[PDB]
Paper text:
10-Formyltetrahydrofolate dehydrogenase (FDH), which is composed of a small N-terminal domain (Nt-FDH) and a large C-terminal domain, is an abundant folate enzyme in the liver and converts 10-formyltetrahydrofolate (10-FTHF) to tetrahydrofolate (THF) and CO2. Nt-FDH alone possesses a hydrolase activity, which converts 10-FTHF to THF and formate in the presence of β-mercaptoethanol. The N-terminal hydrolase domain of FDH (Nt-FDH) binds folate and is homologous to glycinamide ribonucleotide formyltransferase (GART) and methionyl-tRNA formyltransferase (FMT), enzymes that are crucial for de novo purine biosynthesis and translation initiation, respectively. In this study, we determined crystal structures of zebrafish wild-type apo Nt-FDH (zNt-FDH) and its ternary complexes with the substrate 10-formyl-5,8-dideazafolate (10-FDDF) and the products tetrahydrofolate (THF) and formate.
Numbering used by the authors: 1 to 308
Write the structure that this text describes.
């Protein structure tokens, strides 16, 4: 069928590539403008194939759809919109235009974790199960009826990168391909999202990923891994913003060490720089271990190497 891919990232690129390879006609790719002279992976592949690329800065202006860009969109004659990691606001005029409307990839088990940082919140909340949903876009945010859903276990030390690389990305690509298959072959369902279990959270940015120290060790562990790598949980240390990566919980066989104390403003007590990384305390007397630290615009350095 005729598909417009509206989105970005290597995930968007892979979904484009697999749909193409399944015999679908990609009539257009609609992605973000160039930033720092880097073209989005989705745009790179499309161009290589001669598929038309569009890079709208915005689809809307003062609460009204920009007719000139909507018209460019409508001209490619999509029969279905596919939205992998679309970071743009898409007018309902566009969402509803194709005969099959639009499907969206969402990296959580809807109705839980609506919002653009669902992977982060899956981990921040310490969920035991995670996964993704392919759903039909409606006018709300991640509220449309479910086409399909796939689950995975969340590992205790999973960060955003590990669960994304292990499951959400490669199975997510397959799920999108399968969803289009079901649509083409005419049997895709529209399961209304249940009310029970619905949650919605905010977008994670550097600013709001600052560590709140007045939590138990386990919650701090979840906070750090839930923002690792991006945007990077951080705290001020010695006047400067330090980001934390590679968290594990630490309970026992202590205090071997001997650690070198590191004051962290707001921490329940001083941290310990040790051979195995940076030991941090929660407000419950318990410990976590951070393997890697990063300063602003910085390369990562091992927690063990803080004073060197």
């Amino acid at each position: 069928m005729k598909i417009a891919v509206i989105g970005q990232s290597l995930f968007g690129q892979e979904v484009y590539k697999e749909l193409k390879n399944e015999g679908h006609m990609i009539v257009g790719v609609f992605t973000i403008p160039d930033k720092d002279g880097k073209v989005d992976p989705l745009a790179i592949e499309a161009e290589k194939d001669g598929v038309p690329v569009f890079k709208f800065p915005r689809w809307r202006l003062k609460g009204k759809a920009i007719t000139e860009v909507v018209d460019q969109y409508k001209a490619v004659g999509a029969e279905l919109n596919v939205l992998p990691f679309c970071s743009q606001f898409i007018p309902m005029e566009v969402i509803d235009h194709p005969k099959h409307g639009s499907i969206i990839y969402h990296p959580s088990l809807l109705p839980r974790h609506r919002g653009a940082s669902a992977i982060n919140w899956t981990l921040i909340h310490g969920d035991k199960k995670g996964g993704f949903t392919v759903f039909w876009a409606d006018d709300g945010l991640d509220t449309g009826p479910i086409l399909l859903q796939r689950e995975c276990d969340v590992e205790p030390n999973d960060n955003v990168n590990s669960i994304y690389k292990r499951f959400l990305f490669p199975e997510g690509v397959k799920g999108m391909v399968e969803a289009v298959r079901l649509i083409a072959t005419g049997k895709a369902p529209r399961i209304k999202q249940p009310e029970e279990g619905a949650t919605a959270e905010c977008i994670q940015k550097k600013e709001n990923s600052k560590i709140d120290w007045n939590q138990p060790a386990e919650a701090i562990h979840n906070w750090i891994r839930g923002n690792d790598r991006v945007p990077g949980a951080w705290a001020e240390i010695d006047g400067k913003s330090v980001s934390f990566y590679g968290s594990t919980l630490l309970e026992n066989d202590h205090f071997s060490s001997n650690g070198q104390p590191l004051e962290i403003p707001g921490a329940s007590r001083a941290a310990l720089v040790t051979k195995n990384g940076l030991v941090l305390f929660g407000n419950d007397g318990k410990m976590l271990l951070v393997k890697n630290l990063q300063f602003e615009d910085g390369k990562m350095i091992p927690g063990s190497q803080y004073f060197k």
